[model samples]
Target chain A: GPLSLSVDAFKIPKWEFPRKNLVLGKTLGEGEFGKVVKATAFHLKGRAGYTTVAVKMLKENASPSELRDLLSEFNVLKQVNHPHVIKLYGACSQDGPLLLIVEYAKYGSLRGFLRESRKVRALTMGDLISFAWQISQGMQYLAEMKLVHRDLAARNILVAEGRKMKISDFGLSRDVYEEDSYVKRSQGRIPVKWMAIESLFDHIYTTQSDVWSFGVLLWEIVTLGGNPYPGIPPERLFNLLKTGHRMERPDNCSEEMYRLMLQCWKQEPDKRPVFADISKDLEKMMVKR
Target chain B: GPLSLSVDAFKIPKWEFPRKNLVLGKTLGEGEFGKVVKATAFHLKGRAGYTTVAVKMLKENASPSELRDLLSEFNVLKQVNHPHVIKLYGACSQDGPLLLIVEYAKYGSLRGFLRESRKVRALTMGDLISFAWQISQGMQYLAEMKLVHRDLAARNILVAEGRKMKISDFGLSRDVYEEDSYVKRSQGRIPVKWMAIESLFDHIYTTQSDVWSFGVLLWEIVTLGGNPYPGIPPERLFNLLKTGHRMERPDNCSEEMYRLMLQCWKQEPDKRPVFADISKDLEKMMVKR
Candidate 1:
C-alpha cells in the first residue's frame, strides 16, 4: 500500500504553503539563523522515495532586508546551473519565513572537514586544488553573467560522499556593474577574511578580489583545514597587519609550493592567478607531486 | 693510548683542505649554487661529534658579481650577533669554494616542517603563535638595526629540536636603503612567497614588506604547513592577483582570524601591520584560542 498523509504534514502551523510536494524528516543541522531538516516528497501516482532537503525556518530576529536577501539567494540558486555550484531543487517562499529545498551534500561543508581532521591527509593536494579551481570556474561564469558570489569560504563548499565539491550559500550574492566592467564591492556581500587586501580596505570587489579569496582557500586545503589564525587575537591581528606583517607558511612546504602561495597572498589582488590557469596548474601539480 | 697520529692524519689534502676546521660529512641538501652538508667538527681537545650545518659553497659557475654578493652575505652574518638569528661559526675561503660554517638545525627548515606536517597541528596553536611572535621579535630587532631580510620564507627559517626557530639564509639580506639600492637581476636571487605584495610588485623591500611576509608565515602556521598556492600555477597566480585577487580563509578559520590575515595582506604596504602589533595580537590570541 502507498503511504499517504494529510495536508497537515506539509504545513508548519504558523506558515502557509503554496507548493504541492511538501515533506518533512529528522533535523540535520542547526545554526543561529534557522534549522535544516531532512524531508521526503510525495508525487501523484505513487509515494516517491524520501529526499533530504534543507528547510530554512526563518528566525524571528531577521530584519525585513535579511528576509528579502534570503529569498533572493533562493532565486539565484534556482536559476544558476553549474557542476561546481550547488543545485536548488525547489523553495517555499509563500510561508511566513522562506524555505529552500537544496540538494543535500553528504560530506557537509569544507569547514567541517578542516575542523574535524587532525591530519592534513584528510584532503589530498589534488582534491583541494580541484575544489579551488572549480570555485574559480563557477565565479568566472558568474562574473561573465554579471553576477558575483559575495561570500566564498569552506563552510560554503558542499561535498558529496564521492568527494564531489559544490559551492553553497548565496545569501550575499548580487549583480553589479556591466559584464564588461569589473565586479564592484557595492554589488556583493563582503566577508572580511575572504576579501582581497585592496577590497578589504577599499570595499571594492573585483574578479581579482575573488582570486585573492581563492588563494586563501588554497592555503586552507593544504593545511588540512586549519583555521587562518588559530591562536592570534583579532584586535592584534589588525594592528600587526596594519604594520605590515603577514601569516607564515609551515616549515614542511616545498619552495615551489610556497612561492605559489606567496603569489596569491600578494597584497595587490591584481597579482592573483586566474581560475583557468589555476585549474591547469593544479592539474599539473596533482600529477607532479 | 688515545689514537695518536701525525698532524698529517688530521690535515686535509692541498686540494681539499680548508684553512679553517675541516668537517667531513655528506651533502644533505643542495640548491642551484650552494650545498648543505652533515659533518663532524673536531675541537682542539680532539673531541668530535656529528652536526648538521649549512655550507653555502660557492660554485665556479657563479658570476663574479654573484660571488661578491655571496661574500657580502658571509660578511654580514659573521658581523651580526643575535640569539634568534643564525650564527656563523667560521669561514673557509682558501679552498675551491668559499665554505661558510653555520649552526645546523636538525629539524631542517620551517618550510620543511610545513611540507611534512600537512596539518598545522604538527605545531600546536600556542606553538604557532609563539613561533610567529618570536620571528617578529627577531625581525623587529633586524629592522631596528636598519637591516632587511629581503628573502624571508619557510626555507630561510631553521628549527631546533625544541621547536625554537632561528632566522637564517642571509645571502639576500641587505642594509636598509643602502647606496647600491638596486639588486642585479642576473644575480638570480628572487623574492620568495613570503614577500609582501608591495615588494613583490614594486621591487620595494621595507619594514612593511617584512610585516607582510610575516603575515603570510602566520597563515602557513594556521594552515598546518602548506604552500600559499599549492594548486595554482605561476602565470595564473600572477594574473589573478595582479587583477586584484587575494587568498580567502579556509572553512574552519574564524572571522577574527580572517580579518587579521586581510589586514596584513592589505595592498598598500604602508597600511600593512607592524611586528609589535602582530606580537601583541598573537599573545592575545594565545589566551583566547
Candidate 2:
C-alpha cells in the first residue's frame, strides 16, 4: 500500500533534534497535563527548508516516573513504520519540559475539528468509511507488533492534510500478550470513562478494552465531540457501567456503523471483532450505503 | 408561617474560618469539590455540653459567585421553619472558602449509604416510603418560599442523627417565579441532567425542573444511588429527551413511586405535579406502604 501525499514534498524537511530546531508557533490544544503546539522545525546547516511539526509538551509538575515512562514509550514509537500512524521525527529535553516533535497534522485532531464544525454532517459516508479503515489498519499493525494503543479517543486521532486519519499519542501505549503471565506491567491508572465494564471493575486491560474505547471514539466522531454523559451526575456514572449498560445507538449514525459500535462494546472480550474483520465490515457497509 | 430560628442565633463563630473549626471533627465523606465534616459544637465555653454539626466546605475555586449566592440564600434559610429541611446553625466565611455549619447527619448522605448497601437487597418498602415522604416535606418548604433546589442529587440530601431525611446543600438554589424575567435574572447555570425535558431544550425552568431533579433523586435513593442513563453518551441522552424518552422504571420501586417519578419528568412543565400535590401523594404512599 503506497502512502498518499496531499502537499508538495518540498514543504517537508527531514527530522533532526536538540538545537532549538523547532520554533513553536501557537498552542493547538491543551489537556490535563500537556499541550499541543504547532511549530516549524528549522533545517540543519547543510539541509533544505523547515519542516512543520506538532510538539507535545508535558506539564512541569508531572511525576518523574510518569515522565520516564512517557519517554520510553516515545522511543518505542520510533520503531513503528505504519503509514496510518503519525510519524515522530525526534524529541528534545534541553528545555524544562520534555517535547515530542512529530509531523504537523494540517486538519488538527479529529475531535477538535468535529467540535469546531458542530456535527459530523460535513462528512460523507465515504469519508467515514475511509477514516475507519485507516484507524483499523493502524490498530491492526500495532496489534501485530504485540502493542496496544490504550488511549484511542477521537482527540488522539488526527486528520492529515490529505484528510487521511492517523493515530497519535503513545504515552499510555503498552505491549500485549496472549497469556496472563505475559501481560505488560503498568502502574498508570486507565481513563475510567473510556474503559470497558470489565476493565473498570476488574482492572483488566485486553484488546477488548481498546475496542471499547474505540467505540466511544466513534460515538464522539458521529456526535461531533459531545461528552459521554452530558448531564449525568459523576457519581452515578460507575453504577451505570457496573450494570452492563452502554450508550444507545446515535440517531445520525448509520445502522451499519451503530452495529460496529455494538461489536466493539461486546460484554465478552472474545466476542469483539478483530480490526481485520472490522475493516472488511466497514468496507461492505460503505458500499451498501 | 413562623420563622424557624433567629438570624443572630445562627451566626457562625469568627474563629472557625481559615482552619476548619476544631468544633467540627474529622470529615465523614468527601466529594470532587466539597467535604462533609462530622463534629460536635459546644453550646458553652466548657466541654460540659455539645451539639453535633456537619460542616460542609465548598471548594473555593468550584464557583465563587455561586458560593456567595449560596451564602445569601443561607441568610434566608435562618427564617425557614420545616421539620424535613436541614436546619442552619451558623456559617464561617472569614476565610477564603465559606463553610456551612449545619446539624450533623449521622446516617450520612442517602446516596453513599445506598451505594454501600446494594439497592435490591438493602431497603424495604416502608423505609423507601418514609424516606420519600421526608424528602417531599423538605421540597414543600422550598416550594412555599418560591425557591428551587437545582442540585437535588441523593448526595445532597442528608439523613439526620434522628434518622429523618432533610434536604441539604443549596449552593445551586434559586428563587422561583411565574415570569421569565425573574428566571432570566438568576446567575447560575441550570442543571440540565436533572432538568425536565422542556427546561433542557427551551430553557424554561420552573418548580417542574425541581420535580424532575427530585424524581432522579428518588431513583438514586430507591436504587441506592444508581445513576440515570448509566452508560449513555450525552448526545444519545439529548436525543432521547428530544424524542420524548423517559428512563424505564426500576424493578424495585413501587408502582405509585414509579408513577410519581413519571409525573415529575413530564415532557411539559405545566403537566408536572405541584409540591403540595407531591407531598399529599407521598403521604398516601407512606401510609399505604
Candidate 3:
C-alpha cells in the first residue's frame, strides 16, 4: 500500500501515489474500485513523517472503465479540500495498480456504525445530530464544487472521533460509464434505496441527486441503521421510490424529523435540498447543543 | 393558571384540560414558578387515552404576583392548540400547587440536549430543519392569533416521543409583571440574549419580537445551544445588540441559513421575515435533505 506516484509526468497534477511511502493492512471494505484496505502513508523523502491511512488500490483485474473512473476519482479527490471531507494524500495510476492513500477513519464507515448501533451502540440525540451535520458539511463542500457524489451513502462515509464524519469513496462518479445502459443494466450494485428516481431511470446526476441520498442517510440515523426499503425487493424498490413511495418514518422519529426525511427523499432531484442548506440546518442543530 | 377569565370567554371558547385522572411523578426540571415534573393523565371515559406528560407547578410559598402570572400563562396555553406548540393537559389551582400539566419530553429540554451534544442528544438534519419549521409553524399560528411568546429559546422547547418538538415554557411571559419597564426591571429576569433590540429598550412585546427571538433560536440550532454572545457580559450585551452588532456566522452554517437568521434578527420588526416565510424556506430545506 505504498503511496504510489505519477506513472506519467505528462498527466496533470501528476499521476500516482509513491508505493515506497505506503504500507497496507487488513481490507477495510470493497467498492466499485476495489478492496479498500487499512494502511499508512509517510512523507518519507530523505526524512520521514507518518499518518495512518486507507489504501484503495485497483484490483489486478478491474474492468478497464471502472479503473479509469477510479483514477479520475483520484484526480477529483486530490484537488478538493475541506475539513470534513476525506483527504487524498497521494495517488497512483500506471501500468500497475492505481492506488490512492487517504485518511483512515478509525470508527469506519457510517453505515457500519448505523448497523451496529441499533441497540448496542446506542447513540445520543447529539450523536445523531453531529453525524448528520458532519456528513452535511462534506456534501455541502462537494456540491459547492458543482460535483455530484453519484455514490453518496452512509457506507461510503467514514466515521472518526466519536461519530465525527467525512464523506469518502466518491469516485469520479459523473459520466464514468460511457455505455451507461449496458454497463449499469448488468452490473449495477448501486445503492438504489439512496438514489433519486431520475438518477435511476434517466441517469441524471446532480448535487440535488446527492441530496436525495443524504435524505436516506438521515433515515439511517433515525432508524438506527435500518436498511432502506427493508422488506421490499430491490426490483420493486425502484418503482416504489420512482412513483413517490418512500420509507416510512423510523419508529421513534419525530414528526418534524420525518417531514425533513420526506423532503430529502424527493422524487425529483431539483426539488431536493442542497448540501449548503442541509449543512446549515444540521449545523444549527449542532450549535443548538 | 388563570382564575380571571377573559371578557369573551363565554364566546371565544371554553378551556378544558381534564384534571380528574392526573397522576404526577418525579420532577424533570425546575421552572421560575416551581418544578416541572413527570406525570400522566387518563381519559377512562375514552374520548382520549392517557399519555405521559410534564407538570409545571407553583412553589409552596408563591408571591401573589408570580401566582397570577402563572394563572394567566395557563389561560394562554389552554386556549392555544397547534401541533408545534406545547399542549395543555390540565391545570389545578384548587389544589395546593396550582399545577399545569402539559406533554412530557422524554429527552428533556432542547437546551440539555444541545449542551450534551456540543457535545446526540443528535438530531438528523431533518430533525433540525423540522425544529426550525415547527417553531416557525407555532409562531405562525401565534402570529395569526395575534399573540406573542415573550420568552422563546431552545431551552424553552421540549422534545417528546420520537424527538417531536413542542414550543413550551411560554406561560407567564410578558404581561404578568409588566405594566411597564420599571416593574419588569425590578422583578424577574428576561432571557435577553434571545431578545430583540425593541424588546429590551423600547418596552415592546409583539409577534415581531417573538420573530426576533426565533432568529436566535435558529442560531441556537446551528450552533447547538451556544450562548449568543460568548464573552460579552449581560450589561454590555444589550447596548452592543442595540447598536446592530450581531453574532457571527456559526461554523459550517450555510450563507442562506445565516442570512435567514439575520433576517429574523433584523432591527426593524416589519423588515424581519415572518414565520410563514421562514417556515416555507425551512420546509424547502427539509425536502432538500
Candidate 4:
C-alpha cells in the first residue's frame, strides 16, 4: 500500500519495519480500509523481544490509487504525538498490502468500558473525571497543535489502565460504524447528533465541530454510555437541534458538568469554549465537588 | 489517619470515600509519608466491579502532625484535573492511616524511561517532543490557574505506556532520595535544583517557581535524565544559580530548544516565560521540525 506512495510522512526512516517480522493475530477493531489486528513485531531495532502492536491493514477491496491517496492523507496524522493520542508505532509495506502499526490498549475501547455502565454505573465521579479530563487533555493537545479531529466520539476513544483514555482513529473514515448514525449523509459519516450548528448546515470542519462532538462525548461518559438525544433519529436530530432544542441532562450527571458540556454546544462556533478553556473548567469542577 | 484533620480541600463533598472498602496489594513505589501500593476498591458507590487503584500508605514512622501538614499541602492538588496531571482518586482516612488512592501508571516514571536511553539511544527526537509537550500542556493549565508545582522534577513525572507523561506527586514534599542543600527550613522536600532562585531564599512560592522548574525538567528530558550541573555539588547549586551561571547547553539540544530553556531560567520571575508561551514555543518547534 505504501509502495508507490512516497512522502516524508511514511518515509520517517527507521519507522518502516520489516513486514516478514510481524506476527498478526485476531482483529482488534475494523475501519473502512480493514480491521486492525494484534501483532508482535520482532525486527524493530534497538529493542529486543517482540513489541505488541495493532496494525491497520488495507482491505483487498482497496486499489493502488486509493492506497496512495490514503497514505498522503495520513502523512500529517503520522507526525502527531501526544500521550492521550493512539501512538502510530510504524508501518509495514514489504508484503501484500500496507500495514500501519499502532500501540495496543489492553483494556480496549472506551465504548467497551462505557458499555460496562449498562449493568450499573461501574465507575465513580472520580472515574468520570479520569475519562473525561483525559479526552479533553488529548483534544487540547490537538487544538494547540492546530489539528482538528473531524471524527471525535465515544466509540473512537480507547481506554487503558486507571480509566485512562486516548483519542484514536485520527484520520480514518468511520464507515465501519454506520449503524450508529440514524441518517447517512451525502458527504458520508456526519455524526448529526454531535455536529455543530454551523458544520451541520455548512459542512465546514473546524475546531468548533470537534468541540461540539466533545460535548456529546462528555454526555456519553458521565451518563455511562447513555444514548445522546434518546429516540431522536439522525435525520430528525439536525432539525431538532436547529430549533435550539438540546438533550436533557442525565440523572447521574452533575449540574456543573452539564453546564460545561452546554458551553461546548453553544450555537455560535465562536461562542463555544475552546479545549483549553474546557480543560480549565473541568479542573475547576474538581474542587467545586 | 481519621483525617478527622480536614481542610476545606478535604471537604469536596464526594472526594473522601470509606477507607474500609479497599484491599491493598503489593507496593508499587515509596514516598516520604509512605509507599503507594496496588489496591482494589469494593464499596465505592455506583461501581459494581472491583476497580483497580494505587493507594498511598503512610509509613509507621509518620507522626500525626506530619500527616496533617501533608494534608494541608495537598489542598490545591486535590482540585487539579487534567490528562497530564495524575488523578487523585479520593482518600481513605477513618481506618488505618491516610491511604491516598490514585491512578496507577503501568509504565512507571518518565525518569525510568529516560534512564534507559543511556544504554540504547532508544527514542527519536519526535519521541522526546511528545513527552515534552505533554508536560508543557499540563504545566500550562496549572500556570493559567496561578498554581505552582514547587516540587517539579523528572522523578516526579510519571510515564504510562503511550508516551503519556503526567506531573505527579502533586502538593507533596520532596522525595527523601534527593541529595540537595542542607539549607532546609520550615518546609521539607524542596528540590534545590528545580526551585526558582527567589523561592529558594524568600520562600515565596509562585507560578514563576514552576516556570523555572519546568525549564530544568525540559533539560532533564532532552539530556535523557542526566544530573543537573554534572559535577557541581548540590550544596552549591543555589549559590551558582544566584551568580547567574546556569547549566550549559545539553548535547544534541537544538538552538530553539535551548533558547526556550533559557527563557524559563530568567532571573526576574515576571520576566520568565509563562506556561502558555512555553507551550506555544514548543509547538512552533514541532512545526519547524
Candidate 5:
C-alpha cells in the first residue's frame, strides 16, 4: 500500500494556478472543445506585476471525458520546453472549465503575420528563411522529445515577441480545423494538404509525417502564407502525390530551398530528412545569403 | 535571526561527491598545481555502472589558498551547462587532495586531435567547419552566461566522443600556459599571440578579447592546429598587431573564412561581431557547401 501511494504521488499536479489569480480578457478565438482568450496573470512566476498570457479554456458544458481530454492536451504542452514551442505557464484544473495558460505572442499567428506583412511591407529573404529555421528547431525539439506534432502548419505557429516563431495548438489541432474543407476527411478532420501520404491513407503520424508538413510549411513561407494545394481538391491529392507531384517552386524561392522541400516531400516516409537535418539544411542555406 | 540564517544557507555546497566512490586509473596529464587522471565514478548520476571521468586533484604540497582557487574554478565549471562546453560532474572537497571531477573526453586535446588526424588522413572541409562551428557555439554560450574565457584556444579545447569539441580548462588557463614562450608576458603569463591589443597592453579581458582569440583559434583549425605567429617574439608581436599585422591566410583557407578572421581581429574591439554572429555566419557558409 505504501509503495502504491509513493507511485501515485506522481499524479499530483504541481503547475495548478488558482482561478482567482487569472483575469481573462477579450476572446482571441474559439474552437470545438473551447475558446482561447488573452489574459493577465497577477503574481505568476512571482513577478511583482501581471504578465500577459494566452488561456485555452474548455466550453462550460464540456463533459468529464472532455475535461480529461483537455487535461491530456495540457500534459503534452507542459512537457515540451523549447524557445520555438509555445510555453505552458500554468493550469486551472481545480476551478471552472479547465484553463491552460500559455505564453502570449504579440503577432498572434505566423500565417496572419505573413499575410499582414505582405500588405504593409515586404519580407526579406532573411525573414522568410528565419521563420522556416525557427519552425524546424521547434519540430526538432518535438521529435527529440518523442512527440509527433500531427498538425505542423504556419497557422498553428505564433509569432512571439521580436519576430521569433513558436509552434502552438499541439493537441487541439484535430478540432481546430473543423471549418476547413481541405481538412474534412471521411473518418475525421485533419490538415489533409499538410499530411504526408502515409499519414493520409494509413492514418500514421510520425516525425517523418511532421517533416512532410514542414515542407508544406516552407512553401507557405515562400508564398507569403498562401494556402497549400491552392485550388487542388483533397480527393485528388493522394493520386497526385502517388504520381510524384509536388507543389511548384515559388518564383522568389532559392533553388537549394526548393531541393530541400523536395527532400522533405519524398513519398517514402522513411526517406524524408528528419526535422534536425531540415533545420541544419535551412541554417546552412541562410548563411550563404 | 531566522531570516539571516535562511539567507546564509546559500553558503552550503551541494555538489560534494564522496571520494570513496572514485577509482583513479591512468594519469592523463600533469599541471602546475596537480595532475589530472582518468577515473571511474561508481554510483555517480545514480548509474548502475561506473562512468569514466576526469579528476583534477591538487598536489599534496598545495596551500590552502591554492585549494580555494581550485574551488572557485569548480564553481564556474559547475554553473556552465552546454553541449560544447566540458561538464563538471562534482567535487571531492570533503576528502583529501580536493578533487574536481569533470567530463572525460575520449580524444584528449583538440589540438592533438587535429594534428594526429592530419598525419593519419586529410580532414574534409565539413570536418574543419564543424569544429569551428561548435567552438563558436560554446563561446556564444560563455558570453551569454557573462563568463569571459580569458584563454580561448584550440590547445585548451578537448575532443570528446563523436568528433565533438568542448571548451575546457576554464580557471586553469593562466597556470596551464606558464611554460610556453608566447604566454610569458611582462606582468604575468598569457597567450600573447592570441590576446587582443587591449588585452595585451591594458590588461583588459572582455568578451571582445575572447573574440580576438577565436580568430586565432579558427586559424589553428584551418592550419591543422598550427602554432599562432610561429617564430615571432612576444615583444615584437604587440608592435605587429598594433601596426595592422595579422597572420597571412593559410593556403587551404577559404576567402570568406579568412575575411571572418580579419573581422575578428579588427583593431576596435567593438567592431568585431559577437560569437553568436560568427556562429550564424559559419552555419550559413556550411549550408552553401
Candidate 6:
C-alpha cells in the first residue's frame, strides 16, 4: 500500500497500441519526413469493433530528430480534449518508424472543401460562418490550454461531418505538401502571406501571431479559399505589413466580420483580443436558423 | 360592318374596379402626396372570392400633375406581365384621387427583408444570390419590353412569398418618401449614388442607364441594404463617378461577383451588359441547392 503511492507517479505508461493491431490502408498523404496513412485499429473501443483513424508515421530514412518531434507532438496532443481539435487516440511506436493515431475527419482539409464548394457554389454563407465559429472555439480552447498553433491556416483545418472544422497539422504539414506559394527564407520555407508582422520580421510567434493567421483564415473562408494577399509577392509582404497594409475586405464580407478580422491583426500582440473574445464575437454573429 | 373595325380598336376600356367594391383595411404606408393601404377587392379574381391588394392613392388637394403621373404609371404597368414584376390588377379612379390596385406581396419591400435578415443573420448567401437572379430576370423582362426603370434600387423592389423579388416603383417612389440621402438638383431629388455617369451629367436615361442602377442594387443586396458609397456625400458623386471612382468591392463579395458589378458600371451605357447577360451570369453563379 505504501509502494502504491510511488507507483501512481509513474503508473500510467504511454498510450500505445500494438503495431499489429493497426492495419494501414490507403496513403492519405505523404511528406518529406513522414506519411499519414488511413488505418483500421482493431478493438480500439473494446473487444467488439474497429476504429478508422489517420496514422502519422516517419519515413524509413527519417532522422532521429524528426521522430523526436513527432513523439513530442503526440505528448502535447495527449492533454488536449476538445470537439473542434483533432483527437489523438494512441501511438504505435514500439517498432519501425514512430506512428501516431489521430481522428480521421471524413471530409478532409477545409481548404479543399472550400475550393470544391466554391466551384459548385455548394456551401452557403451560413456554412462558411459556421466554420469560422467552430475554429474560433477550437483556438480558444488551445489558447486556454497555453498552446500556440504555429500554423493556423485553412489547409491545417479538417472538415468533419456536418461541416464541422477540426484543426490538425501539429508541425507536420509544413514539412510535406511544400506548395510553390511558400517562400524559402534563411530559417526555412514559410507561409509568408499568412504570417503576422512580428512573425515575418523577427521570427517571433505567439497566440497573437496565431490570431493574425486566424484573420487570414477568415479571409479564406469568405473568399471560398482565396489565396491570402493575392497579386502581392512574398518578398513585398514584410514591408507592406510593416506599413499597416492589411488585406482589403474580401468581396461580400460583412462589415462586422471584417472588423473582427482587423481586430485579430492588431500590431501589438497585447492589443489583440484573445481567442475567447473571438469565440464570443463569432458566436454573436451566428444565425440561429 | 365597316364601323366594327373602328369599334374593335377602342373595344376595351380602362381596367376599373368599382371604388365601393374595395374596402381599405390598414394603412400600409403614408407619404406626403399619397398613401398605400392594404385592401380587399370583393370578387376581384372571380365571382367567388376576394383578392388582397396594395392600393396606391393620392391625398385630397393633390396636384393634377401627380395624378397624371400616377395614371401613366398604371398604364405602363398594364403592359407588364412577368413573375418577377409586380402585377397591376386594376384601378379605382371613379372617385377620390385615382387608386391603383396592385398585387400585394406578403413579405413587403426587399430592402426591409434584407435589413431584417441581416439583423437576425437569417438569410444565406444563396438567398442573396437568388434575389439578384430574380431581379435580373425582372429587369430583363422590362428591358426587352423597352421600359426603363429609372429608379432601380433595393427599396423599390418588393419581396413576395417564397422570397420572390418583384420590381416596383414605376416613377412613384421618386415622388414620395424622398429620404435625406437624395440631393435635390435643378430638376428634383435624384438618387445620385444609383445613377450612371451619363444620367447624372446629361439627364439622359435609358435601358443601359438602368443596368448601372442594377449594379448599385446588387451592391445594396450584397451589403444587406447598406447605403452605397457610405462615406461619400451625394454632391461629390458626379465627379467621383466621372473619374472612374467606383465603389470598392464590398466585404465578403466573391471576385466573380464583383467583376459582374463592375461590368454594370462601364462608363459608356452601351458597354454595360444587358439584363439578359446579367441574368445568365447570375444563373451560372447560383448554387443548385
Task: Give the higher-TM-score candidate: 1 or 6.
Answer: 6
Give stretches of model 5 more than 4 Å off: A1-289, B1-13, B31-34, B59-68, B119-121, B172-188
Where is the poorest 10-residue window by lDDT in model 6 chain A? A1-10
Give the clashing pairs for model 4. Answer: B174-B189
Q: For model 5, what TM-score does chain A reach?
A: 0.86
How well is each residue in A1-289 modelled by candidate 1, as lDDT tens digits? 0000111223222223335676767776743234567765444123265555556544432322234455557657766888878876666544333577777777777777666664442655556666666666777777666666656667678776577778877766666665432334221233344555555444565666666666767677667666665444221222344465556785445566666666766776666776666667666766786
Per-model i-RMS: 28.1, 21.5, 31.4, 28.4, 35.6, 38.3
User: True-contact fraction for model 4?
Assistant: 0.00
TM-score of each: 0.44, 0.48, 0.45, 0.45, 0.45, 0.45
Q: What is the C-alpha DockQ of each candidate?
A: 0.01, 0.01, 0.01, 0.01, 0.00, 0.00
lDDT tens readout by residue for model 4, A12-97: 34567888888999888764334578889985656698988778765432322234434643564576788898887777654335
Instruction: Give one digit per residue, the lDDT tens place, for model 6 in B239-277.
Output: 577789899999868888999899999998778998889
lDDT of 5 by residue, A1-289 (tens): 2211221242345688888999999998754345789999988877778999999875432322233345556768867789999998888754344578999999888888898876215788888998999999888777767676776788788998899999987653332223212232222224457778766655556778778988999998888888787656343454577788999987788899999999999998778998878888988988998
lDDT of 3 by residue, B117-150 (tens): 7322555656677778877888888777666677
Indicate which candidate wins on TM-score.
2
Off by over 4 Å in 3: A1-289, B1-20, B44-50, B118-121, B173-188
Grade the docking of candidate 1: incorrect
Docking class of 6: incorrect
How big is the positional error of residue A53 in model 3, measured in Å on the Cα after superposition? 56
As for lDDT, the candidate ahead, 2 or 3, is 3
* Candidate 6 lDDT over residue span A1-289, tens digit each: 1111222222233577888888999988753235788999987745467888999876432322344345546767887889999988888644434578889988788888888875224766677888998998998887767676767888789988777889887742221123212222222223557767776665556677788989999999999988887655344454467789888988878888899889888888788878888888877778543
Clashes of 3: 49
TM-score of chain A of each: 0.79, 0.84, 0.83, 0.85, 0.86, 0.85
